Design a protein around this ligand. Structure first.
Ligand SMILES: CCCCCCCCCCCCCCCCCC(=O)OC[C@H](COP(=O)([O-])OCC(O)COP(=O)([O-])OC[C@@H](COC(=O)CCCCCCCCCCCCCCCCC)OC(=O)CCCCCCCCCCCCCCCCC)OC(=O)CCCCCCCCCCCCCCCCC
Ligand SMILES: CCCCCCCCCCCCCCCCCC(=O)OC[C@H](COP(=O)([O-])OCC(O)COP(=O)([O-])OC[C@@H](COC(=O)CCCCCCCCCCCCCCCCC)OC(=O)CCCCCCCCCCCCCCCCC)OC(=O)CCCCCCCCCCCCCCCCC
Ligand SMILES: CCCCCCCCCCCCCCCCCC(=O)OC[C@H](COP(=O)([O-])OCC(O)COP(=O)([O-])OC[C@@H](COC(=O)CCCCCCCCCCCCCCCCC)OC(=O)CCCCCCCCCCCCCCCCC)OC(=O)CCCCCCCCCCCCCCCCC
Ligand SMILES: CCCCCCCCCCCCCCCCCC(=O)OC[C@H](COP(=O)([O-])OCC[N+](C)(C)C)OC(=O)CCCCCCCCCCCCCCCCC
Ligand SMILES: CCCCCCCCCCCCCCCCCC(=O)OC[C@H](COP(=O)([O-])OCC[N+](C)(C)C)OC(=O)CCCCCCCCCCCCCCCCC
Ligand SMILES: CCCCCCCCCCCCCCCCCC(=O)OC[C@H](COP(=O)([O-])OCC[N+](C)(C)C)OC(=O)CCCCCCCCCCCCCCCCC
Ligand SMILES: CCCCCCCCCCCCCCCCCC(=O)OC[C@H](COP(=O)([O-])OCC[N+](C)(C)C)OC(=O)CCCCCCCCCCCCCCCCC
Ligand SMILES: CCCCCCCCCCCCCCCCCC(=O)OC[C@H](COP(=O)(O)OCCN)OC(=O)CCCCCCCCCCCCCCCCC
Ligand SMILES: CCCCCCCCCCCCCCCCCC(=O)OC[C@H](COP(=O)(O)OCCN)OC(=O)CCCCCCCCCCCCCCCCC
Lengths: 231, 116, 109, 50, 359, 93, 51, 92, 178, 149
């Protein structure tokens, strides 16, 4: 399982290895002799185009809406208590209307879905237009998440919990830098791996590696300090 | 309409969902636990038949024995409820208000709060 | 444990068993022949009959373990000697009583 | 005094406002089911990124 | 089958001997009160029919047989391999785990014997249950397949349920006000209910995981599972991430419910509230030294090939548990709750350490 | 564990592949990378993924219009005769 | 126990609409462990010959 | 059914026909959804063994297959050469 | 893992995290045993609430044994639990898990206060009477006192002898080929 | 010279003399002594019984009396008949444990794990590269508990 696999890819390493690259265009090119239906259907590669700002914004909005609906399903609705009269009226609606459960679900999940969509879209636009080209990635993520979650906690939940929102945003930013923008459990390269370029003979490479080993010996404390017994 | 593998894989968790969903009456939960054990029995038999696995086929009697022992323990606990003065409907053992119950109402065992 | 040769060798078929007496007799004969040959790299083809007997008698995992142990023993023999190791261990144990103070104002590196 | 100690104290108190001191069977079973369903949901959401 | 090698069942002889001795002595103690007096027999003193035997002798017997098992382990010799149809593993690490469990059980039994000599509020059935737990729990580390592990853990769970059942209920205290009034205490029923249902959930989820592991790989042995998973990762043949993730989730959630880790902890708090101090003394030892250690070894040693899925689940569980208990641990007002939440916090810390290790 | 038995007390059909895979794993110093062929054969004999993919492809092809009539099978001579040719055993005749 | 058959007066609609229906919908949407098993009638029975 | 009418008076067809129909419709819709869309997507057999796979997963699978084949071929060739060299050196 | 002309060099011991985990489990079991032995030495019926920590306000041995056991569970440096917590953090740093270190530290400090707050309740107006009476006198168990004393000595001076225990645990774990 | 004769009543003390602190040998490591019968069944293991196993049983019988009395000392509210029966049960259990130990010793002698009176024609000698205990054992009592090639 990997998070944000496409962004954290070593294009040079995959190219030298021949491994397929996630940066390939992934586009359809219908032929000029193809049918009109085929030409119309080949337009779906737009839905895959990733440089599409509006597509990405709607993608983030859908993710946020799904998260909000899941939260409502799990914790929010069950924690919130509905008035007895309201419950009786909606049950009567279910009795008097076919598929009344669907409409009740729509009514109950509209607030969570809408707020999740808004949060997702705003968060995507925020992160992409701002903080995308900062120098310190960790600091940028921490500050952006802190501010965004501070505002979100102030608005959605309560203006009196904005400090806790900011702290949670800092924590979430650290977590995101750790496991979303970085590959700690998603390694696709062996540690110490490298690639060779230029016309160097194997003898020269072995000589250089011997010199590197001689330098590496100095890392050991005993040899550096000359504190070894005569074996 | 559904392949047997997917059908049984889904209905096991559906049975678990029913067990959690139904009102918490110890006898009902015991019956649902027995049904869950039998669903596991059927799924194990299906997979054993598919993969020619005598171990999966034999898991049947192990599941039956475990279910029987758990059912005996459940019977004993349900009977112990009487001596421990607990309603089988666990939701009635606490004073927390519950809209899911039409007639949940408890009062302190008193006749008059104010004397003067 | 997927990378562990020892555990993969410890795995076995339900009805498989090892005749340790016969396998070890064959391995002892083959290793005696190899030692008599006394080459840097064990060339089993120099001892065909004993090599075939060893392969037949011993299992693949036992053979792998034996070859790894032989490689380690060859390296140790090439490196160290009994008296050298005894003296070195005695010197190190004697040193262990003392302290290792830092060397301030070094000259190297 | 407030921004260093009272903040955390009030956070703990407000969180405990929503915690039942005594466990009940309905809560036990509902928590188990919620874990089972929604840990799977969140893990599959991470897997897909729909 | 023509020849039955002694290597397949050499290790079962000491445990069978201990089981025989324990159960024979238990039956003799049960029928102890029956002693016929023949018409020609003469009694030096009037028989005291009312008897309340102290279990110190049972505890000493348990200590003696544990020490004999320790001697057997110390004198043990053999090859490192599996025995009895590859269902049990016999290697240095597993034997060391067995010895460590036995040693800790012996020390705790010694302390319990001293406490019982101080005061007796525990029956002989209590320590017979402890004897069964001590005899059968160290065998878990000798498990070579998830199937045998499940059966052994089910047996140990039944033994622990027996121990909880035999907990003392009514005491002869100095309160003389409730002679003619009904006092209701639900601790016994709460303990039994929560233990029974947690065991049910854990067992069903573990059986589901076993079935799907058999489906994925022809066997359920640890080595075969790891080798098949690694080879599948190499080949890219079986690539049902949904199925692999769901199997891992089922296993982890089953163990979470079994142990009582932060996401599911309140039942553990209730059990600790309803259990005696000596029961907690033994249960914490059993839990930490066997159940949680095997839970860690699932990710470290046994199912290490699946760490590519376990890491995220463990991280999410740890984060949720920490943020859920940070406020709860300061809401308790009971000694048993304090002990249980100490255990829970240590469990969360050890889970974080396990994540770091599997990294 | 892999008992290796069938559902009628016989031998599990995957036993040869399992034995080959285990032998390779024991013999090789890098079993994960040097037993790919044997492990893939065992996994195929266990799961049958490749045959399911082939069946899916054949279903798609049959859905496509390419086959009209298969040749009849003359069982007496154990031969195949084109559907166009008439035979006594032919359904239409 | 419970000879007369009278049971607790329980209304399942509240929980069904608050927690269970949406959770079940999500679980059904995102849950399928069957990898490649094929239904009967997927291909003509005449292609199968091993039986 | 002896006294079939008296037996079937209360529940001839169903106790809650509307709910039974909703169950049937839900089962039908879920089976259709699974079989037609979800399980095929997970199986990913549409482009299996395609010469020009447009799916990243299929491309990765084919890359794994070719890499494993190349590794096996190279190791077999090297082992054959090593065995030949050992056999030649033996008879000296 | 370093490569120099096809010579692998390994300066890391893989069978070390398991040893650290075993050490933490053993340390927690030892401290739990100490506290539970202190409890068992006394009358059990007295301790039923966090307020009842004052009931431990008994003669110096019991009082200070409880105080030091609580501090060790909290993770105060000189005591035993600090060894486990510090080694866990050291291994996390070795594995380069800064976020794991952060969450470990948060949990550690919260649990530290959770343990410490009971020292406030330990204060009692007078000296408690928590010992069972036998033969008209309080029953003090020499064996349990001796066990508590050994546990106290090890809790105080575990840092001095921790190298031997670490060696033993690493020796046990090395048999695992992971 | 380091181990008691396997055919003597004290031959059962070699169980405590071990070359290394390991529990079991690796899958492929040659046993310290020649193998007499690797695939040993119950009947042949019993037939291989020896004065060493009889001495182990005698040691168990001798040591089961103090241990049985120690166990019995924690008994209360017990009649004389029940006390004697409990003593008999504990003593029989200890003797059965001794029989099990003798059986295991016979199995080890058959498999070559312990001294069975035979020696390999060519010893596989190690290089004692790491030595933290040679001098300690030589100057201490523990040289008796270890076996060195
Ligand atoms: C397979 C397993 C399940 C089988 C069926 C159930 C039987 C087994 C039960 C045991 C298992 C656990 C059950 C626990 C029940 C919990 C409580 C409850 O709701 O029941 C009590 C409920 C009330 O009981 P009652 O009080 O006795 O009865 C009172 C009234 O008589 C009652 O009448 P009513 O009309 O009031 O109730 C109707 C009831 C049942 O519903 C129905 O009437 C039938 C619904 C059919 C599904 C329709 C959706 C479209 C399907 C398309 C399929 C093909 C897609 C192909 C894709 C191709 C792509 C290339 O409605 C609901 O439950 C409401 C939700 C239904 C809609 C589901 C929508 C899912 C997709 C949404 C995605 C996101 C959309 C975003 C917005 C889009 C806007 C454009 O009981 C019932 O009505 C009977 C049980 C029915 C259970 C339904 C469970 C929900 C699952 C629905 C199907 C999911 C399909 C997912 C795949 C397709 C996705 C597109
Ligand atoms: C908080 C920022 C993030 C927000 C995220 C959410 C965004 C929502 C979507 C976009 C909304 C567009 C604007 C419409 C109004 C929305 C608000 C609203 O109605 O609220 C009700 C009320 C206004 O409603 P009303 O009274 O009924 O009448 C409004 C008229 O109808 C107003 O109508 P009008 O006819 O007069 O025309 C208004 C005109 C005015 O245009 C402007 O002026 C806008 C451009 C300027 C603002 C730029 C943003 C701020 C940049 C500066 C950032 C500084 C941060 C520094 C941080 C430092 C570190 C601590 O805007 C438009 O109508 C243009 C609309 C064009 C379409 C936009 C497409 C949006 C697509 C996405 C929709 C999302 C749907 C889901 C949403 C729900 C779920 C989340 O507004 C508020 O209560 C806002 C309160 C703001 C805070 C208090 C301000 C006074 C005290 C100063 C506090 C200083 C704090 C500074 C930061 C912290 C420092 C420590
Ligand atoms: C840096 C962190 C370190 C953390 C450390 C954690 C643990 C610390 C606390 C516990 C340590 C163990 C303390 C001794 C056992 C307790 C009982 C006892 O002896 O006192 C009662 C007994 C009181 O006698 P009393 O007052 O005259 O009369 C008492 C009753 O009236 C009449 O009594 P009775 O008739 O009822 O019973 C008499 C019998 C009572 O004795 C018992 O029943 C002993 C109960 C405990 C059994 C478990 C011991 C395991 C030892 C191994 C190491 C692990 C320790 C684990 C401890 C915690 C586990 C929960 O007495 C004895 O024979 C005592 C012998 C004790 C030594 C046992 C050695 C067994 C070794 C087995 C393993 C060998 C290695 C195999 C390798 C395999 C390779 C293939 O004490 C004494 O006779 C001496 C007391 C004063 C000196 C004590 C010296 C203790 C030395 C401890 C060394 C620990 C290891 C080295 C340090 C490691 C870290 C660097
Ligand atoms: C476990 C570790 C915990 C870490 C704690 C993290 C602290 C979080 C603090 C959040 C503060 C609230 C959000 C601030 C968002 C804006 C940040 C920004 O502009 O910096 C980006 C830019 C982007 O930087 P950069 O990435 O281009 O370059 C980084 C440079 N080096 C490598 C040297 C670090 O950073 C800065 O210029 C500031 C960096 C330091 C942070 C300063 C925060 C100031 C907050 C007050 C602003 C007041 C504005 C005026 C109004 C005053 C009142 C009237
Ligand atoms: C060169 C020639 C050499 C010839 C050597 C021939 C002799 C060989 C045998 C030597 C045996 C030495 C003593 C062994 C231990 C005796 C224990 C005993 O009797 O204590 C009774 C005591 C009984 O108590 P007690 O008799 O001390 O009195 C109790 C008094 N109250 C109750 C008031 C305190 O046993 C115990 O207390 C132990 C209880 C726990 C169970 C421990 C089992 C240990 C089993 C050990 C088996 C033998 C191991 C031998 C190892 C040899 C290694 C080389
Ligand atoms: C083997 C035994 C044979 C003998 C059995 C006894 C036979 C005689 C009695 C039979 C009926 C029982 C007594 C009923 C008395 C009450 C009458 C009454 O109210 O009406 C009855 C019923 C009334 O049913 P209902 O709608 O009221 O049911 C709900 C019942 N309550 C109110 C209790 C919730 O009449 C009908 O339902 C008639 C219309 C529907 C019939 C069923 C249609 C679906 C199933 C058959 C499909 C056939 C093929 C076509 C479909 C497509 C195929 C591809
Ligand atoms: C967690 C739970 C605990 C741990 C796990 C549980 C493990 C369970 C699996 C154990 C498998 C053990 C199988 C052992 C089979 C071999 C036995 C053996 O050694 O036999 C050798 C001998 C055979 O030795 P042999 O194999 O050498 O003989 C063949 C020799 N050749 C080939 C040369 C001809 O067996 C027998 O002769 C007897 C067989 C058994 C007879 C029936 C015995 C029934 C006993 C019932 C109980 C009696 C209780 C009495 C109590 C009295 C006091 C109250
Ligand atoms: C995540 C892991 C670690 C977890 C531990 C905690 C980490 C915290 C990291 C950030 C710490 C920033 C310092 C302040 C934290 C507390 C918040 C605060 O001081 O600002 C609150 C104050 C508004 O107060 P008010 O809303 O009236 O009261 C709360 C009502 N519920 O003011 C506001 O409205 C907030 C304004 C924005 C915050 C500005 C803070 C600037 C501080 C500068 C000086 C101190 C710097 C210390 C750190 C240096 C770098 C290490
Ligand atoms: C022998 C060896 C050993 C094994 C022994 C086995 C013993 C089996 C014992 C069976 C006992 C049967 C009698 C008791 C149950 C009767 C059914 C019942 O109680 O129904 C409950 C439930 C549905 O209940 P409800 O929704 O309220 O509606 C009732 C409609 N009948 O019911 C359900 O869940 C579904 C009920 C379905 C009923 C179907 C009726 C079909 C009638 C067919 C008539 C003839 C035409 C057949 C055509 C076939 C074409 C293929």
């Amino acid at each position: 399982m990997e998070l944000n696999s496409s962004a954290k890819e070593d294009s040079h390493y995959v190219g030298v290895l021949g491994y397929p690259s996630q940066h390939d265009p992934h586009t359809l090119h219908p032929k000029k002799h193809d049918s009109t239906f085929t030409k119309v259907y080949a337009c779906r590669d737009m839905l895959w185009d990733h440089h599409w700002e509006v597509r990405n914004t709607l993608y983030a909005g859908f993710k946020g809406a799904l998260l909000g609906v899941a939260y409502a399903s799990g914790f929010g609705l069950i924690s919130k208590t509905v008035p007895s009269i309201v419950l009786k009226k909606m049950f009567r609606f279910v009795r008097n209307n076919n598929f009344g459960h669907i409409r009740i679900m729509q009514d109950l999940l509209t607030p969570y879905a809408l707020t999740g969509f808004g949060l997702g879209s705003v968060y995507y636009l925020y992160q992409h237009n701002v903080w995308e080209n900062r120098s310190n990635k960790w600091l940028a993520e921490v500050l952006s998440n802190a501010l965004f979650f501070q505002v979100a906690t102030a608005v959605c939940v309560n203006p009196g919990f904005h400090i806790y929102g900011m702290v949670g945003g800092i924590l979430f930013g650290t977590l995101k830098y750790a496991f979303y923008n970085s590959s700690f459990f998603q390694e696709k390269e062996s540690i110490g791996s490298y690639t060779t370029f230029g016309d160097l003979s194997e003898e020269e490479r072995k000589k250089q590696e011997y010199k590197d080993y001689i330098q590496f010996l100095g890392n050991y404390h005993k040899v550096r300090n000359g504190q070894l017994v005569d074996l | 309409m559904l392949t047997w593998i997917s059908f049984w894989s889904l209905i096991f968790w559906l049975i678990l969902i029913i067990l959690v969903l139904k009102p918490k009456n110890f006898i009902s939960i015991l019956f649902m636990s027995e049904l869950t054990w039998l669903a596991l029995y059927c799924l194990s038999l299906l997979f054993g038949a598919i993969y020619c696995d005598i171990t999966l086929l034999s898991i049947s009697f192990f599941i039956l024995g475990v279910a029987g022992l758990e059912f005996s323990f459940g019977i004993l606990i349900a009977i112990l409820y009487k001596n421990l003065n607990e309603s089988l409907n666990t939701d009635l053992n606490n004073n927390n208000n519950n809209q899911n119950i039409f007639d949940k109402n408890f009062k302190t065992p008193l006749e008059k709060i104010n004397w003067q | 444990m997927e990378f562990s040769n020892a555990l993969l060798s410890q795995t076995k078929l339900p009805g498989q068993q090892y005749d340790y007496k016969r396998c070890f007799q064959a391995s002892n004969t083959h290793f005696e022949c190899l030692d008599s040959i006394r080459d840097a790299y064990d060339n089993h083809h120099k001892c065909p009959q004993t090599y075939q007997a060893w392969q037949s008698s011993c299992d693949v995992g036992i053979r792998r373990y034996q070859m790894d142990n032989r490689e380690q023993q060859k390296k140790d023999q090439l490196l160290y000697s009994k008296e050298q190791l005894k003296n070195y261990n005695a010197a190190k144990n004697k040193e262990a009583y003392g302290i290792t103070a830092p060397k301030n104002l070094s000259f190297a590196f | 005094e407030y921004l260093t100690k009272k903040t955390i104290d009030s956070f703990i108190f407000n969180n405990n406002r929503f915690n039942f001191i005594n466990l009940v069977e309905s809560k036990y079973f509902l928590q188990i089911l919620t874990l089972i369903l929604y840990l799977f949901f969140i893990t599959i959401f991470i897997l897909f990124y729909i | 089958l023509l020849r039955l090698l002694v290597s397949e069942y050499i290790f079962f002889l000491p445990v069978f001997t201990n089981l025989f001795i324990y159960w024979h002595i238990f039956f003799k103690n049960n029928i102890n009160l029956v002693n016929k007096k023949n018409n020609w027999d003469k009694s030096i003193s009037v028989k005291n029919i009312i008897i309340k035997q102290n279990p110190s002798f049972i505890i000493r017997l348990n200590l003696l047989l544990n020490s004999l098992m320790v001697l057997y382990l110390i004198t043990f010799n053999g090859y490192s391999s599996t025995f009895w149809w590859s269902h049990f593993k016999l290697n240095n690490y597993s034997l060391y785990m067995y010895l460590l469990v036995i040693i800790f059980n012996n020390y705790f039994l010694y302390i319990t014997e001293k406490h019982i000599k101080i005061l007796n509020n525990y029956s002989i059935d209590y320590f017979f249950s402890i004897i069964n737990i001590t005899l059968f729990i160290p065998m878990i580390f000798l498990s070579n397949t998830l199937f045998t592990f499940f059966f052994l853990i089910e047996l140990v769970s039944c033994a622990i349920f027996y121990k909880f059942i035999v907990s003392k209920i009514s005491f002869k205290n100095s309160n003389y006000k409730d002679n003619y009034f009904s006092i209701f205490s639900k601790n016994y029923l709460n303990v039994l209910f929560y233990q029974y249902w947690s065991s049910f959930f854990s067992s069903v989820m573990i059986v589901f995981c076993i079935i799907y592991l058999f489906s994925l790989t022809g066997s359920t042995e640890w080595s075969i599972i790891n080798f098949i998973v690694a080879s599948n990762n190499q080949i890219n043949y079986y690539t049902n991430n949904i199925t692999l993730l769901f199997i891992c989730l089922t296993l982890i959630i089953g163990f979470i419910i079994k142990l009582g880790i932060a996401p599911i902890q309140l039942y553990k708090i209730e059990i600790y509230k309803g259990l005696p101090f000596l029961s907690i003394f033994f249960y914490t030892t059993f839990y930490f030294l066997i159940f949680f250690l095997f839970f860690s070894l699932l990710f470290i040693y046994y199912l290490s090939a699946l760490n590519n899925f376990f890491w995220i689940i463990l991280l999410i569980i740890s984060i949720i548990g920490i943020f859920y208990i940070i406020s709860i641990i300061f809401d308790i007002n009971l000694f048993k709750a304090f002990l249980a939440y100490s255990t829970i916090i240590n469990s969360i810390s050890f889970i974080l350490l396990i994540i770091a290790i599997i990294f | 564990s892999y008992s290796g038995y069938s559902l009628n007390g016989g031998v599990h059909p995957c036993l040869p592949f399992y034995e080959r895979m285990l032998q390779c794993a024991k013999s090789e110093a890098l079993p994960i990378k040097m037993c790919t062929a044997q492990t893939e054969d065992y996994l195929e004999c266990h799961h049958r993924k490749k045959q399911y993919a082939l069946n899916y492809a054949i279903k798609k092809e049959l859905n496509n219009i390419r086959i009209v009539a298969l040749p009849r099978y003359d069982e007496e001579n154990d031969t195949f005769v084109p559907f166009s040719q008439a035979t006594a055993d032919h359904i239409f005749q | 126990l419970n000879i007369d058959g009278l049971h607790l007066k329980y209304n399942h609609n509240i929980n069904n609409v608050l927690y269970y229906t949406p959770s079940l919908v999500l679980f059904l949407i995102f849950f399928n462990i069957d990898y490649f098993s094929e239904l009967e009638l997927f291909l003509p029975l005449e292609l199968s010959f091993i039986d | 059914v002896y006294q079939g009418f008296k037996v079937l008076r209360r529940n001839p067809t169903f106790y809650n026909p509307r709910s039974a129909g909703m169950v049937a419709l839900s089962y039908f819709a879920y089976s259709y959804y699974v079989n037609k869309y979800y399980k095929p997507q997970n199986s990913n057999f549409e482009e299996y063994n395609s010469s020009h796979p447009h799916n990243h997963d299929e491309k990765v699978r084919q890359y794994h297959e070719k890499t494993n084949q190349a590794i096996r071929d190279a190791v077999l060739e090297k082992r054959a050469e090593h065995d030949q060299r050992l056999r030649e050196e033996a008879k000296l | 893992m370093s490569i120099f002309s096809n010579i692998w060099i390994n300066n890391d011991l893989n069978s070390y995290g398991l040893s650290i985990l075993l050490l933490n489990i053993i340390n927690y079991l030892i401290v739990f045993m100490l506290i539970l032995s202190v409890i068992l030495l006394t009358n059990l019926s007295k301790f039923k609430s966090l307020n009842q920590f004052k009931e431990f306000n008994s003669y110096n041995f019991i009082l200070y044994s409880l105080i030091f056991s609580l501090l060790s569970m909290a993770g105060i440096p000189p005591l035993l639990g600090f060894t486990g917590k510090f080694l866990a953090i050291l291994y996390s740093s070795f594995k380069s898990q800064y976020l794991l270190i952060l969450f470990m530290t948060i949990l550690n400090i919260f649990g530290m206060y959770f343990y410490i707050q009971n020292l406030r309740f330990v204060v009692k107006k007078n000296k408690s009477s928590i010992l069972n009476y036998k033969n008209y006198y309080v029953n003090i168990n020499y064996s349990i006192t001796l066990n508590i004393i050994l546990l106290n000595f090890f809790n105080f001076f575990g840092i001095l002898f921790l190298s031997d225990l670490i060696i033993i645990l690493n020796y046990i774990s090395s048999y695992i080929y992971i | 010279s380091q181990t008691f004769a396997h055919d003597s009543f004290l031959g059962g003390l070699n169980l405590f003399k071990r070359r290394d602190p390991r529990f079991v040998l690796d899958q492929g490591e040659r046993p310290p002594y020649p193998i007499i019968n690797s695939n040993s069944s119950f009947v042949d293991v019993l037939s291989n019984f020896n004065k060493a196993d009889f001495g182990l049983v005698l040691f168990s019988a001798a040591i089961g009396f103090p241990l049985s009395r120690w166990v019995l000392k924690g008994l209360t509210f017990s009649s004389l008949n029940y006390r004697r029966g409990l003593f008999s049960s504990v003593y029989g259990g200890v003797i059965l444990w001794g029989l099990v130990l003798g059986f295991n010793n016979s199995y080890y002698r058959l498999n070559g794990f312990v001294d069975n009176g035979l020696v390999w024609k060519r010893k596989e000698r190690k290089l004692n590269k790491y030595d933290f205990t040679s001098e300690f054992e030589d100057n201490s009592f523990f040289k008796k508990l270890r076996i060195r090639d």
